[PDB]
């Protein structure tokens, strides 16, 4: 019926404490989604080109050239932390939980409303909105994951984080195949390097369509759609950070002489000369046993080529790295490769009363200390004569290939059988929750964007489209675009995301770091006088844990 | 006639490979456009050898690496191979799927 | 901005300037979000000597 509501708005986070210290967390999110009709009812194949930018020698890092199928449909993506948890709930979770499991996910659409804009021809323009009770909203649910997976948080296009603000969906578009060549150059590179877009190789063409691969439900003003509960199987996400590096693994050396009076200069002394110490070292030609040369069980962290660009059929891409930098915690402005930087708009955290289109930005300096500090590690000759000379060492200050600004660490990879690393920490509120595992026979060990990875499947993507509202002059034989009555839709989206977490237990004398309100961040969690809201980034691994 | 074997190179249809002339390295500062001192192009020599560039000694295999199994080759391709006796075993074999 | 007429030179344009775009990148010291610097889930393929 038109006058009977088909659902209830619900945005309450529930905690239900189970046996053995586990907590059943239910995050109900509810939004009002506004949807305009598509620009055109037809699928487009658009080749986006920015050769003007890359035509300038040395700008190869600014390539946006690609090919995309632009579709008339719109994607309703809720794969972002902010959509589910308000700052207080996240504070509770990070301060008192230790591990997080993704349990279930369900979503539904109700109170579908379709309206048409009749723009009067009156000399002073005016427009009246009318309820078209017969219009239909097409809802498609890719339950079988037939369509390409296109997470929205990567582009900051998920639903809004404010329950009391209407949100808009994102027009769905998926990459089409293409070939590209961008020979790197630098300021001073003579001529124009080879920069060509070869087009689409026929063997790799895929042209998906929702109308052909997904059943489509037509919802009038009195209808509702529910996706049913989806159950995850993702690995647990740890809410604790590791501080121990190789230098802090195992039994420390025995201090034969200990300080006698408190002070900043009263250090402990091992006493025994370095060459006469007792231990085990992987270096078989030196008797010097040191805190640096001692044998650790394995390697915590791996050095990777940083700011290295790799070319493939589609052009250049930046090599990802799964660890943060060392010493970047001192200042966010001193961040470097590996620290994820998020840019977001007024829907996703930026002060809602800000003027201008400049996105709000922040670099997330993770609390885990498993990264690398390239200025430190060096290489020296096998003879290990000490002190080393210029001919027997390769310091980070040394050039490679004659380039004064590029040193050896830029092309150094220490990933090996002994490498150990942690999963990506959650980022609030702009961070993604789950991601799909790759279809490759051999699959990546971890993803750099989401902490939870679907082993089998992720929930089907939800697509919404205002059904065509034809005028009486329609003619399919006309090459011109279809004439449509201006129409839009407002519908309420309600989702339930269920987590399971473990409550932390104190295991040390000293307290641990905790998220708290303070005089500096006070006014970042309350509205301004003109209704301005914001959601600042919050750290998710404040509690430490021992690695070995 | 003759003992010259018949030869062919199997260019697999999968597009998960790399194009060494493309990918490059640049300084962390990421000042743009990059200058000579802040980039290491594939045209740059390593150790003074004009024909050997940095991609020859570059390994990007890491925890995020993903790859596909070897495609079958007909008719001369092998079908099955034995897994190694090593305690830690290779992820895939380059000769049999 | 999408093309209006079919042709080999009618490409689509993103419109927004590179430095003012919205997204996530693993590079924490650049505001330039590009089709190359954007963060992908993982790495398909590996360069080897």
């Amino acid at each position, epitope marked *: 019926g038109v006058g009977i509501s088909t659902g209830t708005f619900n945005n309450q986070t529930e905690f239900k404490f189970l046996e053995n210290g586990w907590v059943y967390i239910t995050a109900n999110s509810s939004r009002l989604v506004h949807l305009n009709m598509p620009e055109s009812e037809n699928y487009r194949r658009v080749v986006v*080109n*920015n*050769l*003007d*930018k*890359t*035509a*300038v020698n040395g*700008n190869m890092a600014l390539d946006d050239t690609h090919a995309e199928i632009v579709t008339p449909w719109s994607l309703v993506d809720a794969n972002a932390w902010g959509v589910w948890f308000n700052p207080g709930d996240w504070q509770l979770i990070v301060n008192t939980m230790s591990e997080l499991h993704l349990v279930s996910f369900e979503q539904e659409i109700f109170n579908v409303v379709l309206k048409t804009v009749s723009e009067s021809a009156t000399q002073p323009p005016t427009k009246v909105y009318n309820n078209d009770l017969t219009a239909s909203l097409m809802v498609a649910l890719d339950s079988n994951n037939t369509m390409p997976f296109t997470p929205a948080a990567m582009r900051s296009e998920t639903l809004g984080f404010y329950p009391w603000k209407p949100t808009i969906p994102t027009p769905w578009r998926y990459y089409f195949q293409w070939d590209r060549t961008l020979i790197p150059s630098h*300021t001073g590179t*003579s*001529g*124009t390097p080879t*920069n*060509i*877009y*070869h*087009g689409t190789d026929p063997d790799d063409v895929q042209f998906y369509t929702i109308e052909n691969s997904v059943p489509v439900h037509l919802l009038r003003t009195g209808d509702e759609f529910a996706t049913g509960t989806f159950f995850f199987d993702c690995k647990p996400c740890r809410l604790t950070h590791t501080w121990q590096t190789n230098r802090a693994l195992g039994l420390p050396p025995f201090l034969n002489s200990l300080p006698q009076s408190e002070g900043g200069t009263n250090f402990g002394y091992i006493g025994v000369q370095q060459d006469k110490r007792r231990g085990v070292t992987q270096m078989g030609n030196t008797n010097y046993i040191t805190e640096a040369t001692i044998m650790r069980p394995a390697e915590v962290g791996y050095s990777a080529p940083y700011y290295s660009f790799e070319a493939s059929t589609q052009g250049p891409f930046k090599t990802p790295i799964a660890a943060g930098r060392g010493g970047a915690q001192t200042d966010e402005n001193q961040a470097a490769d590996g620290d994820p930087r998020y840019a977001f708009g007024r829907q996703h955290g930026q002060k809602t009363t800000t003027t201008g289109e400049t996105p709000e930005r922040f670099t997330y300096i993770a609390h885990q200390d498993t990264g690398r500090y390239p200025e430190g590690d060096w290489i020296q000759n096998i003879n290990f004569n000490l002190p080393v000379t210029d001919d027997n060492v390769l310091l980070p200050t040394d050039p490679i290939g004659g380039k004064t600004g590029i040193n050896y660490t830029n092309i150094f990879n220490t990933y090996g059988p002994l490498t150990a690393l942690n999963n990506v920490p959650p980022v609030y509120p702009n961070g993604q929750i789950w991601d799909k595992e790759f279809d490759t026979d051999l699959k990546p060990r971890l993803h750099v964007n989401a902490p939870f990875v679907c082993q089998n499947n992720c929930p089907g993507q939800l697509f919404v489209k205002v059904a065509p509202n034809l005028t009486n002059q329609y003619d399919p034989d006309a090459s011109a675009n279809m004439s449509r009555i201006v129409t839009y839709s407002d519908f309420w989206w309600k989702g339930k995301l269920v987590f399971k977490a473990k409550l932390r237990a104190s295991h040390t004398w000293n307290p641990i770091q905790q998220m708290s309100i303070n005089v500096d961040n006070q006014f970042n969690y309350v509205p301004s006088n003109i209704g301005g809201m914001k959601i600042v980034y919050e750290k998710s691994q404040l509690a430490p844990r021992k690695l070995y | 006639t003759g003992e010259t074997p018949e030869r062919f190179t199997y260019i697999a249809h999968q597009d998960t490979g790399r194009y060494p002339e493309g990918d490059w390295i640049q300084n962390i500062n990421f000042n*743009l*456009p990059v200058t000579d001192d802040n980039v290491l192009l594939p045209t740059d020599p390593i150790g003074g050898k004009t024909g050997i560039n940095y991609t020859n000694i570059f390994n990007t295999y890491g925890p995020l690496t993903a790859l596909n199994n070897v495609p079958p080759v007909y008719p001369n391709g092998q079908i099955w191979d034995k897994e190694f006796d090593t305690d830690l075993k290779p992820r895939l074999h380059v000769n049999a799927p | *901005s999408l093309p209006q007429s079919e*042709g*080999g*030179t009618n490409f689509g*344009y993103i*419109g927004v*300037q*590179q430095d003012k775009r919205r997204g996530v990148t693993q590079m924490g010291n650049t505001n330039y979000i590009t089709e190359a610097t954007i963060m992908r889930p993982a790495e398909v393929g590996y360069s080897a000597p």
Partner: antibody
Amino acid sequence: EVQLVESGGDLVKPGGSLRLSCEASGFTFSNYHMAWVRQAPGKGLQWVANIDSGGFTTNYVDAVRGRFTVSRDNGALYLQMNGLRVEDTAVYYCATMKTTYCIDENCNSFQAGRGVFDNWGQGTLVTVSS
Amino acid sequence: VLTQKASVSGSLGQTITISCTGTSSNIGHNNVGWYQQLPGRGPRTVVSGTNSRPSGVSDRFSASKSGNTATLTISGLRADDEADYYCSTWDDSLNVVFGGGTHLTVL
């Protein structure tokens, strides 16, 4: 249709300064590299300067190098002229430099390039004398 | 400066050719563009490489490039073709280089 309109041409004294403008409409002005090209009375075309699509780099000819400057504001082009000399008297035009060239008739594949100007403005006359 | 012929002349309906020349190190690797210049008008792009014409340009124009030389062919002269023709390109010294022009004329 693409529209480029120049303005600012006027009589000026030698050794002074001036500002010429090139307003653009009907196309994505920010997606195209731009160029200032001058022609003296009855003489051939002479390249004055050029600027990229983001202002990262600008290039000049030796005659105006160190004297003039070029800038853009996403809506129009500007040429700042300093140290004007008698020979500078000429008509100036703003043209889009074709940054892409398709290599097939339907032009499914395209390549980067330089040295071809696609669209031109109307042009403006600058006279420097007493 | 690229080399060009000062002028040419021909009868109506004749298919004619004009040439621009320069060092292959600059005219070779870079593209070449041909523009028309009528009295009381700014240069109009007639040929933009790959034998492709801008919209609104008569199909009579054609162009080709070979090493040091670039050739522009007109398939049948018309009274409105009496005008200056200008070749331009990019130069590996990071310049934009034009020719001296050629005043096409009709007998």
